[PDB]
UniProtKB/Swiss-Prot annotation, chain A:
Organism whose genome encodes this protein: Lysinibacillus sphaericus
Keywords: Disulfide bond, Sporulation, Toxin, Virulence
Upper classification of the organism: Bacteria, Bacillati, Bacillota, Bacilli, Bacillales
Subcellular location: Spore, Perispore
Recorded name of the encoding gene: binA
Protein name: Binary larvicide subunit BinA
CDD domains on file: beta-trefoil_Ricin_BinAB
Curated annotation (Swiss-Prot), chain B:
Listed name of the protein: Binary larvicide subunit BinB
Family: Belongs to the toxin_10 family.
GO BP term, example: sporulation resulting in formation of a cellular spore
Comment, domains: Has an N-terminal beta-trefoil domain and a C-terminal pore-forming domain. The trefoil domain has barrel and cap subdomains; the cap has 3 possible carbohydrate-binding modules while the barrel is involved in host cell receptor binding. At neutral pH the carbohydrate-binding modules are accessible on the toxin surface but the barrel subdomain is not. The crystal is very stable at neutral pH, upon ingestion by larvae the crystals dissolve in the alkaline midgut.
Compartments, record wording: Spore, Perispore
UniProtKB keywords: Disulfide bond, Sporulation, Toxin, Virulence
Species whose genome carries this gene: Lysinibacillus sphaericus (Bacillus sphaericus)
Post-translational modification: Processed by proteases extracted from C.pipiens larval gut; unlike its partner BinA, it does not form a stable digestion product.
Other notes: In protein gels runs as a 63 kDa protein.
Subunit structure: Forms a heterodimer with BinA. Upon toxin crystal solubilization with NaOH at pH 12, only the 63-kDa (binB) and 43-kDa (binA) proteins were detected. Interacts with mosquito protein Cpm1 which acts as its host receptor.
Recorded GO MF terms: toxin activity
Keyword set includes Manganese: no
Region (Beta-trefoil domain): 1-169
Amino acid sequence: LDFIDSFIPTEGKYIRVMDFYNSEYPFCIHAPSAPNGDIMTEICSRENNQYFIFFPTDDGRVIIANRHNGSVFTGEATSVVSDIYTGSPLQFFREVKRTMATYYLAIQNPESATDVRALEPHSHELPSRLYYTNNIENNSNILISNKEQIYLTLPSLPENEQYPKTPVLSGIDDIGPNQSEKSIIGSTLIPCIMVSDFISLGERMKTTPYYYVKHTQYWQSMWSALFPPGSKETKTEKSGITDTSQISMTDGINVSIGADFGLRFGNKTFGIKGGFTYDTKTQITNTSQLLIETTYTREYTNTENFPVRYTGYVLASEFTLHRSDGTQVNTIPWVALNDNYTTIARYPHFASEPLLGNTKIITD
Amino acid sequence: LNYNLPEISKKFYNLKNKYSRNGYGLSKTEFPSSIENCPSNEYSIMYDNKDPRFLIRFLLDDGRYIIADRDDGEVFDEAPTYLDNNNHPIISRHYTGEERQKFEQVGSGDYITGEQFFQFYTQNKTRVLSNCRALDSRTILLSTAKIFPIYPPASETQLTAFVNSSFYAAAIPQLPQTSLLENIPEPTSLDDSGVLPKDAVRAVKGSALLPCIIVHDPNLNNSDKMKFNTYYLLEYKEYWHQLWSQIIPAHQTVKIQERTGISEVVQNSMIEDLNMYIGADFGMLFYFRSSGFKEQITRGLNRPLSQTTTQLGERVEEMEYYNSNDLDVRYVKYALAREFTLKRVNGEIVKNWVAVDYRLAGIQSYPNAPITNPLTLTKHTIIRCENSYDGHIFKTPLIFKNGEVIVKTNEELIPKINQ
Ligand code: NA
């Protein structure tokens, strides 16, 4: 076969078992079975408590979740504990490679980006908590090695398509399709700990540690009519996103849509907003105002001297949340209509574009 | 492909005041300020209804913007000096990447009726950019800590409201199509030395758009650079870089030196031109000038941020190989080369930087398989290397099957790893 893949294993996503390099006895880093508790070094036991997945974020830092219950590394006063992910600054760690095989885990004070400490045990012969230390240079007691490395099988992501094409009418009586053909703009991977689902966190970690969000666009029909020559007709058009839809997406993937059609990221997903927007070809909002649903009335005039069939389309963006098996999670549509991008399908095709009149907002 | 730049990062917009009745906005006028306690000079950002500025907003990783001018290539800067009522003047200045040159854009207003505007904030929204005193008079732009809530509406807020007007397009190069890496080139005879790096088939794996303010291109003035090369193209490519090519006699063991990595000279060159360089893990490292864009750049390049502070250097290793065949065999070894090319909008190549990745390598031969038996690595010694990020050698003997890519981290090493 004629192509060579240059992807190197360690630069991907995988499950790992961790132990300290200087440790002679077979101790492994061990997460508590309970959702909350102290991170400890225990005898290596091949249990899910000792299998961890590092979720990479925008700035290189990682979120360290265990394979048992999905709780993550949480930095406290003097030691590291296991707890539920909330997007707290104390749950972001940096993997610093001193050598090709050894590394240490660093956490920086949210109060000062200068105060950075590394994780270190107080014993190699006994079970120990993971304490902080400021002595980093030439200190090998903080060095961690990977006992095991199990590579994940990510779900197949769809190929990106170009922007959706405006529907073409077949005749005068053809109102056209209610929707055009859906085009996939992009898709992005999201850690299971940042989404809502009926599957437990522990089970997600084992079977679908990564979900993915799909971004598709298409033209949505608003109205269609046969315009008499010289006729002026008033049409109702909608734009934005419904309250139900906003709430569903916000609870679903911890993302909302701003009034500038940019994405608002909550505490959970704020750390991956750069990768999220890049993969989905979207933008981060610059306003604090949320997108809402608006109903317009626009006047359209057929300037032609013959009957012309017109159908108004508005550009729609839909987001869907999927599991690793491709199943869609959300049962409520996450759709936003943008009236800045509208197109008027017409028959006959050579007919001119309708003359836009006055626009009024419906206050129901 | 798509680098996913915002619309305002692709245009030099004329910034008008929202509430001005006489078409006042940000200007490059040479006339001084007409307001009493609003002194101007040569560095001042002016406000006038004539000689408009056309400004682009380069997007930083954290969402804030660099505001650069199309004509002189300088950027907006918040001066530390104090004016009346303890306000900072906004001045024109060469790009440095300091915090004083970063601005946060905040949109507000009636988005539904298209009556929205935007402001510029600094220092975690503790200061807002504002006209000095006037709405419809020639004055200066400044930073003030006097921020009013939008409700109830304050008149002073109108001095801060901006909208987008006319624009020029920023010069943006097209992104190349990605391609697949070929198989390791086979020799066709005993006299075939194989494929040299200058003739090797490149595969495009990534590309990034670099703002011209972080690129050092001494062949152009800052005006031409900003206007004709607003974004430079940095493409990432891969090819098979030959390490050596030699005929190995039957049943003989030969010493062969393998030189990989990257020289300090090349590292310094990339640092000087782009404030970027290669880490020992072959990930990207950045210095102050371009550090603000490192996340966007790496996502485009499809090369990761480095997780080490150790700089990649030259790697000289001595290997001993044994030919287990009853005949002389032409052997040639290639390693994975990671190539970065800086191009202008027109396509002209500015400079090339190559790192040779010893971790991915393979060997081909003539006569090929199944006529001949695979070459065997019997001894491995690191001769010269200025860092100990990777002081590991292969556990010998190791067989290099023709065409097979040996991944160093997937083999047994000395000292032992992953165990
Ligand atoms: Na006076």
